[PDB]
Amino acid sequence: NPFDLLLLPTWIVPVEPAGVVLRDHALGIRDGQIALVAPREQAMRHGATEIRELPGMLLAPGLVNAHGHSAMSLFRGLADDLPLMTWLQDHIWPAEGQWVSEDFIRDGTELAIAEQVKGGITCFSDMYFYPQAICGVVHDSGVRAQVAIPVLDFPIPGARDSAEAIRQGMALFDDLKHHPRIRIAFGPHAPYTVSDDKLEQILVLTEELDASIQMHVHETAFEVEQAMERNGERPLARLHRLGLLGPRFQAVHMTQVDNDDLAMLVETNSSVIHCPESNLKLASGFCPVEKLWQAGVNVAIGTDGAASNNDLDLLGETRTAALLAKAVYGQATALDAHRALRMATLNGARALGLERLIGSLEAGKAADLVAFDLSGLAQQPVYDPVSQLIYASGRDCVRHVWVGGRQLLDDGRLLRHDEQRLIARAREWGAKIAASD
Amino acid sequence: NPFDLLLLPTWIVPVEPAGVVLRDHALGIRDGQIALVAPREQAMRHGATEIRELPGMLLAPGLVNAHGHSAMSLFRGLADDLPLMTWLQDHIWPAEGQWVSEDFIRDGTELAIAEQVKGGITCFSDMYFYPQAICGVVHDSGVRAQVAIPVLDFPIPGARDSAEAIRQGMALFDDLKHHPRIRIAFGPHAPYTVSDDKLEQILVLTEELDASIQMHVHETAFEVEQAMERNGERPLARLHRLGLLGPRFQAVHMTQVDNDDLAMLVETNSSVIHCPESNLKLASGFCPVEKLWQAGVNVAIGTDGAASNNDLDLLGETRTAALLAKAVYGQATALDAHRALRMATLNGARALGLERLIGSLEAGKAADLVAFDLSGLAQQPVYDPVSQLIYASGRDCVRHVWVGGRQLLDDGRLLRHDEQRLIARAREWGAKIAASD
Numbered sequence: 055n056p057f058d059l060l061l062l063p064t065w066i067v068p069v070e071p072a073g074v075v076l077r078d079h080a081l082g083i084r085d086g087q088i089a090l091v092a093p094r095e096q097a098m099r100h101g102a103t104e105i106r107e108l109p110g111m112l113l114a115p116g117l118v119n120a121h122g123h124s125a126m127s128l129f130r131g132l133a134d135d136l137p138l139m140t141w142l143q144d145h146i147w148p149a150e151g152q153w154v155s156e157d158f159i160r161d162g163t164e165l166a167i168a169e170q171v172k173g174g175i176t177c178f179s180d181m182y183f184y185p186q187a188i189c190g191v192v193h194d195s196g197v198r199a200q201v202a203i204p205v206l207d208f209p210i211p212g213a214r215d216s217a218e219a220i221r222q223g224m225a226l227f228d229d230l231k232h233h234p235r236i237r238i239a240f241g242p243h244a245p246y247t248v249s250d251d252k253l254e255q256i257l258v259l260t261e262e263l264d265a266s267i268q269m270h271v272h273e274t275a276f277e278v279e280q281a282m283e284r285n286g287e288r289p290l291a292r293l294h295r296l297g298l299l300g301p302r303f304q305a306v307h308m309t310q311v312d313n314d315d316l317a318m319l320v321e322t323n324s325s326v327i328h329c330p331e332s333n334l335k336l337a338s339g340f341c342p343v344e345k346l347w348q349a350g351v352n353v354a355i356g357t358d359g360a361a362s363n364n365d366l367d368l369l370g371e372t373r374t375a376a377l378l379a380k381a382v383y384g385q386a387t388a389l390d391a392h393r394a395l396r397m398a399t400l401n402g403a404r405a406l407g408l409e410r411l412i413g414s415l416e417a418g419k420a421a422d423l424v425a426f427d428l429s430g431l432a433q434q435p436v437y438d439p440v441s442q443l444i445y446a447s448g449r450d451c452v453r454h455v456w457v458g459g460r461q462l463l464d465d466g467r468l469l470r471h472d473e474q475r476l477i478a479r480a481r482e483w484g485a486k487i488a489a490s491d
Numbered sequence: 492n493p494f495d496l497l498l499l500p501t502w503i504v505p506v507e508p509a510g511v512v513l514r515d516h517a518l519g520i521r522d523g524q525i526a527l528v529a530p531r532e533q534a535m536r537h538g539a540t541e542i543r544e545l546p547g548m549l550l551a552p553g554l555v556n557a558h559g560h561s562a563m564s565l566f567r568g569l570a571d572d573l574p575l576m577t578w579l580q581d582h583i584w585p586a587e588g589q590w591v592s593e594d595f596i597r598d599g600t601e602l603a604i605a606e607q608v609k610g611g612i613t614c615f616s617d618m619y620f621y622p623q624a625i626c627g628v629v630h631d632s633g634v635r636a637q638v639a640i641p642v643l644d645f646p647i648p649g650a651r652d653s654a655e656a657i658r659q660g661m662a663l664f665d666d667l668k669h670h671p672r673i674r675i676a677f678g679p680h681a682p683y684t685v686s687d688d689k690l691e692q693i694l695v696l697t698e699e700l701d702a703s704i705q706m707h708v709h710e711t712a713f714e715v716e717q718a719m720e721r722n723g724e725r726p727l728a729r730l731h732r733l734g735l736l737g738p739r740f741q742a743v744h745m746t747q748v749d750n751d752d753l754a755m756l757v758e759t760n761s762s763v764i765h766c767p768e769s770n771l772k773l774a775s776g777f778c779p780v781e782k783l784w785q786a787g788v789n790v791a792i793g794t795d796g797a798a799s800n801n802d803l804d805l806l807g808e809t810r811t812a813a814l815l816a817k818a819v820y821g822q823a824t825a826l827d828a829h830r831a832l833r834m835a836t837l838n839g840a841r842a843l844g845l846e847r848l849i850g851s852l853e854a855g856k857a858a859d860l861v862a863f864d865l866s867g868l869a870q871q872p873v874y875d876p877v878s879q880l881i882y883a884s885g886r887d888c889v890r891h892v893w894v895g896g897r898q899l900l901d902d903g904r905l906l907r908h909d910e911q912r913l914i915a916r917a918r919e920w921g922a923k924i925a926a927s928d
């Protein structure tokens with residue numbers, strides 16, 4: 055009974071146990087799962103149909119991009135450096151009104167997946183329009199995904215109202231019930247865009263389905279202050295009041311965190327999705343990551359959409375996060391390199407409810423893997439491969455990617471996408487969108 | 492009268508004038524200098540000995556890395572995530588004492604220059620030991636540099652006291668008087684480490700030689716407080732009192748700025764060198780870049796050493812600066828992409844006193860040029876190439892680099908360095924340094 059594939063990289067970082075880096079080790083894959091992580095000597099005895107040596111490379115769990123709006127890849131750099139509401143009202147919202155259709159979503163989503171896989175990301179979360187179309191693209195691509203159904207108080211592309219959005223959502227939930235790679239979640243945009251009734255409605259359906267909820271929460275001081283002078287109650291407190299908080303709740307951003315907020319996070323075991331670069335670019339503020347971490351809150355990381363980043367580089371986000379957390383907390387020891395990688399992998403898994411399947415290199419879990427090349431000039435000398443990954447390596451060093459043991463990236467080449475076709479298609483869109491803007 | 496070389500990129504960003512992007516244009520070089528920036532049809536009638544078509548590429552002034560400690564490349568990732576004093580006392584200082592020799596400086600500096608050229612950097616400033624060694628390496632590499640003589644109250648490698656370091660500096664200044672690419676400066680480390688006397692000596696010398704001074708200034712709240720309590724005056728204030736502040740003074744870091752600090756920067760026309768990533772990583776603080784900018788202070792940008800970054804990626808550093816400035820200032824309009832590119836180029840030139848030579852694509856200036864490929868998937872679609880450069884491109888997109896019209900990088904290949912042996916050398920040093928650590 056040989057492995058299907060045995061990988062022999064210079065270094066393996068399993069993430070669990072924390073801090074550990076393995077040398078002269080092997081990872082064996084069988085039937086899509088990690089069957090063994092062990093010394094090379096030991097593993098070579100089981101036999102393997104295929105054996106790949108990966109000298110100079112670091113093998114890790116695939117990255118988990120825990121929050122995105124993928125098809126906004128087509129809006130990448132459309133209008134930068136404007137006031138937030140000018141950006142939205144003069145540029146993003148009209149462009150969405152004119153251009154967002156199933157064709158837009160299909161092209162923009164595939165564009166985004168292609169970029170993410172190239173950057174070593176094996177699992178992502180999407181919160182955008184035409185979810186059914188999104189799922190189709192995710193299915194073909196082979197990556198893992200949470201697709202969150204957008205629910206709002208007003209018409210959006212694809213849904214004339216919240217009722218239709220939930221109906222389409224429910225139909226989606228059923229159709230993908232046994233999909234091995236995709237899970238449906240609910241994704242109400244933010245507390246300030248969704249009614250209490252809609253929130254309670256979402257909760258019932260969610261507990262009915264054991265499904266997750268992802269929402270932008272406390273992204274700005276303005277949202278929080280305004281909820282005060284209006285309702286006399288912090289948005290998170292309101293969500294807590296209505297019973298939406300919990301281990302399946304994903305609070306995105308959370309730049310505004312007081313002690314009541316914190317206690318509510320620790321109590322409900324809710325996840326926070328950290329999006330540092332978007333927070334900086336939009337002047338939203340500084341998520342207190344080390345503080346949340348020390349309290350025991352699960353903190354994952356996402357890129358947000360490519361129009362406020364403007365790349366979908368999770369390795370890059372993670373470095374930004376690891377650097378920023380030190381200055382925000384006031385200590386150089388905050389969010390260290392191993393914890394940063396954990397945030398980008400196992401914590402993402404936990405946020406998305408997938409921590410039994412992915413996020414660490416342990417026997418029994420899915421073979422969602424990324425191999426990073428550390429043999430480049432600018433990475434020398436390599437004293438600690440994980441330090442060098444986090445603080446000195448770019449996403450271009452990603453060489454190979456597997457999801458469920460199926461290879462999606464081979465020496466930097468995408469096996470499930472035609473890169474030049476997507477480029478050409480993205481250009482056709484950009485030409486049209488540029489003209490309308 | 493044909494050009495030696497004519498370049499035909501999709502885009503040209505001359506930096507001067509600001510905000511302008513030229514399409515269907517050409518840059519013509521003759522005798523190491525920019526001779527013509529005009530429409531292609533006008534420029535082609537001049538004829539050219541060599542013509543390069545660069546479709547999909549953005550042609551810009553070469554990036555100027557205005558602060559670093561280049562040979563610390565050999566300590567890259569040696570000991571991360573430690574308290575600052577533990578990092579210095581238990582890792583960096585021991586290793587400097589034991590290993591920093593002229594050979595170490597040569598290897599470490601060349602390694603750093605190779606990484607920098609690959610990332611589009613045409614000019615850099617160094618503040619590290621064995622300045623004579625550094626200059627030799629800089630000469631061979633063909634890049635432009637300011638080499639600042641380290642001056643300190645303590646024995647440092649190569650110089651047992653400030654008087655010897657100044658004697659070596661003076662000799663170096665005379666040797667290299669006619670070098671077209673290297674400028675010598677004085678680099679007292681920081682005010683807390685250089686006597687009131689040594690500083691006045693340096694001042695009389697630079698005024699006599701019209702040389703620049705670079706120093707780490709107000710890097711930490713700690714430094715400032717300690718001075719305030721111990722002397723009754725802020726380090727900047729003391730510098731201004733001694734008459735050191737001026738157009739040739741480069742104040743590095745400046746995370747601590749009060750209203751008096753600002754006025755003194757404004758009145759003296761001193762440059763600030765912003766190093767956001769080092770400031771984040773060491774939890775030094777947040778330089779108020781937009782505040783300085785709006786007050787008319789010239790702000791350049793540097794990477795610092797590779798042991799507190801941990802790369803020498805100025806494009807990446809600039810992205811970090813541009814993102815960070817918006818949340819630090821509280822507005823998404825702060826440090827826009829064109830101004831950020833200006834900081835990485837012309838402001839760098841001004842900082843180093845080289846603004847008449849480099850920093851912008853204007854006739855009469857040196858042909859110091861970088862070509863960035865924007866034809867990649869993750870960069871599509873391109874609306875503003877400058878926005879896409881700053882917010883969505885990695886340094887791996889750097890394809891071609893010229894210094895004084897001499898090509899140093901051709902389609903990503905170094906013409907003046909052998910990467911493979913530089914890597915082997917780096918690994919030799921890594922083995923030794925790892926053992927002693």
Ligand SMILES: [Mg+2]
Binds near residue numbers: 363365
């Ligand atoms: Mg990014």
Ligand SMILES: [Mg+2]
Binds near residue numbers: 800801802804807
């Ligand atoms: Mg860097």
Ligand SMILES: [Zn+2]
Binds near residue numbers: 121359
């Ligand atoms: Zn979002």
Ligand SMILES: [Zn+2]
Binds near residue numbers: 743
């Ligand atoms: Zn420095």
